[PDB]
Amino acid sequence: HMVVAGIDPGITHLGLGVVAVLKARLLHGEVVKTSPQEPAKERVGRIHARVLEVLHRFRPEAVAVQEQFFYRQNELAYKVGWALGAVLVAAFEAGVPVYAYGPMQVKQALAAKEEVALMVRGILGLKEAPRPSHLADALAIALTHAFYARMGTAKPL
Amino acid sequence: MVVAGIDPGITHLGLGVVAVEGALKARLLHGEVVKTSPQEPAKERVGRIHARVLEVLHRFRPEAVAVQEQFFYRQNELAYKVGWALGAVLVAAFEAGVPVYAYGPMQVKQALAKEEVALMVRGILGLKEAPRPSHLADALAIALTHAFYARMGTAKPL
DNA sequence: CAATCGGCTTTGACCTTTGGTCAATCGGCAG
DNA sequence: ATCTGCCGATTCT
DNA sequence: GAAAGCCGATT
């Protein structure tokens, strides 16, 4: 009945998952891998294109992204900001509202990192925990949103 | 030689374009500042940013885009939202097939010389007065800094 | 080529027989 | 409507 | 008083 996209942002790996809804089915999962040897604009451009393509194909009602709290080197925050920007243009273009959730919100909603993954595997009925780590986390975010959405406490912006 | 300069921000984004003759001298082709607000949905702020930039790139067809680098960021969250802004730009820069270059403040100040730098920008472009507001002025300086490095063959991509 | 891995987490100016302090940075809300 | 100006600066263990 | 991640190196 309900379709939710989850995202774990980063410039090198970006986790991208989609679920249909507490029990849900895995509709899609991928990780976008871009290189430092790649021109900045090519890196982010590919990101935007893949996300846009995905949003178009599956038409989710919501996108959920991982919030983050500390950032040892300000520069790192910036490049992650770049990644969320591509997403946002994509989210904007698709007319899909965007929501963001912190790690404790995820952990509490669903559960240790190893402990959370076990619950994601279970809700989606998979033989094994999803890989790699960035995809798994993206899916957790999607599922966290669904949970809050189910109780009417969405968290936009 | 056509060069775009950009001063990134989520609230105010400076956007300027110059055409270089060196004997370094250039003409102002375009200048604007994109204003968005926190009362606006995140996706609408950034989306408008991407659209304006993409429209501008399309109209003026520059050979390069230059953006301001930054060094400190007291609150990591600030860096993030600026990251958002650069992302919209990059999609735009990607879509237009325009290479992107980034420069730090000292590179700008040395190449051209805050009040002292502005005076030099005013001069090179032959304007009656220094450009306003501050975010547009800065964007233009970045464009002009790139041209300078480009002229000596020391481009600085992203 | 996948995946895995371990390190590094801001900076420069000018000053202070020496490594010190120092400021820089921008977004939300108020006139 | 527009510039102009100030203040904060990472949680949860 | 720690939380993540990206890079550039491996294998």
Author numbering:
A (entry chain B): 0 to 20, 26 to 115, 121 to 166
B (entry chain A): 1 to 21, 24 to 115, 122 to 166
The authors write:
RuvC resolves HJs by symmetrically cleaving two of its DNA strands.
The junction in complex with RuvC has the same non-crystallographic 2-fold symmetry as the protein dimer. The arms are unstacked, and the two opposite arms located in the vicinity of the active sites are pointing downward from the plane between the HJ exchange point and the protein. The exchange point of the junction is stabilized by the N-termini of helices B from each subunit, which also participate in dimer formation.
